[PDB]
Amino acid sequence: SIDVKYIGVKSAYVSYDVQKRTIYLNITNTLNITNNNYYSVEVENITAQVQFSKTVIGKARLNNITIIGPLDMKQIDYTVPTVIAEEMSYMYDFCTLISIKVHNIVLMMQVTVTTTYFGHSEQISQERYQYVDCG
Amino acid sequence: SIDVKYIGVKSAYVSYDVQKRTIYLNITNTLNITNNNYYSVEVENITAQVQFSKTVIGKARLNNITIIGPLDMKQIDYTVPTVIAEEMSYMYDFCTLISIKVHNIVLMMQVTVTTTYFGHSEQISQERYQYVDCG
Amino acid sequence: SIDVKYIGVKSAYVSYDVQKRTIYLNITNTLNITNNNYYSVEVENITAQVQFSKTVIGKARLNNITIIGPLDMKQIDYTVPTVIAEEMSYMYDFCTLISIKVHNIVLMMQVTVTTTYFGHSEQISQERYQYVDCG
């Protein structure tokens, strides 16, 4: 990868930015640029590539075979009872949360059992996260 | 990888930035640039690449075979009972949280059982995180 | 990898930045740059690469075979009971948290059982983290 940048606020080549309650008087500028970028990414000069796969079974006897794939889940349990009794009193709540399995991002590729691969593979993730905000 | 940058606020080539309650008077500037970037990334000169895979079974007897994949889960349990009794009193809450399995990012690649791979593979993650904010 | 930089606030080539309550008067500047960058990353001159894999089973007898993958979980348990009784009194809370298995980032690659690999592999992670903020 090339130039995978995360900028918090602002990005530029040249910036003359002026913000607040300042004062200019008689400012002069100038700029001369000769930029050039000969990207030559991910090029191939191949004569004979032979991917392959096979299986040969002869005079065999096979019984009770099991091939699971990854990331299984079984017999899980969640129990979040919230009981509230009360009598002749005073209560008050604010910004109460109960969270179970709260996802944000799930990126999956080549999640297989068998995988012959030739080439490139990328996974990029840029974000600004904030779960709870109260006051 | 090339140029994987995380900038907190601001990024530039040249920056003349002026912020607050300042004073300019008779400023002069100038710039002469000859930038150039001959990226030649990830190039191939291959004559004969032969990926492969196979299996040969002959006059065999196989019984009760099991091949799990990675990242299994079984018989897990969570129990978060929240009971509140009360009598002739006063209560008050603010910014109360109960979190179970709160994910943000999950990036998975080539999560397999068998994997023949030829080439490149990347995984980039840039972020600004903040879970709880109260007051 | 090349140029994997984490900058807290600001990044530049040249910076003339002026912030607050300052005073300029009759400033002069000048700049002459001849930058150049001949990246030649990850190049290949290969004549014959032969990845491979195989299995041959003959006149065999195999019984009760098990091949788990990595990162299993079994019979786990969590028990966080929160009981509150009260009588003729006064209570008060603020910014109370109960967290169980709170993830932020999970990056996984080539999490396999078998893996023939030829090439490159990267995993980059840049972040600014903050869990709880109260007051």
Author numbering:
A (entry chain C), B (entry chain A), C (entry chain B): 120 to 254
Authors' text:
However, we found that TMEM106B forms amyloid fibrils not only in the diseased brain, but also in the brains of normal elders. Moreover, cryo-EM structure determination of these ex vivo fibrils showed that they share similar structures, in which TMEM106B adopts a curling stone-like fold composed of residues 120–254 that originally form the luminal domain of TMEM106B in its native fold.
We then were able to unambiguously fit TMEM106B molecules into the cryo-EM density maps and build structural models for the fibrils from normal 2 (referred to as Type 1) and the major species of PDD (referred to as Type 2). In total, we obtained three types of fibril structures (polymorphs) from four fibril species extracted from the brains of three donors: Type 1 fibril in normal 2, Type 2 in normal 1 and PDD, and Type 3 in PDD. The Type 2 TMEM106B structure fits well in both density maps, except that TMEM106B dimerizes in the minor fibril species of PDD (referred to as Type 3) via electrostatic interactions between R178, K180 and an unknown density. TMEM106B conformations in Type 2 and Type 3 (dimer) are nearly identical, while that in Type 1 is moderately different from the other two. The fibril cores of Type 1 and Type 2 both consist of residues 120–254 of TMEM106B forming 17 β-strands, which are arranged into a curling stone-like fold. Residues 120–160 build the handle of the curling stone and are nearly identical in conformation in both Type 1 and Type 2 fibrils. In contrast to the identical N-terminal handle part of the structure, the stone part of Type 1 and Type 2 exhibits conformational variations. The overall fold of Type 2 is rather flat, while the stone part of Type 1 swaps between neighboring rungs. The protein segment (residues 174–186) forms a hydrophobic hole in Type 2, in which unknown densities were observed in the fibrils from normal 1 and PDD.
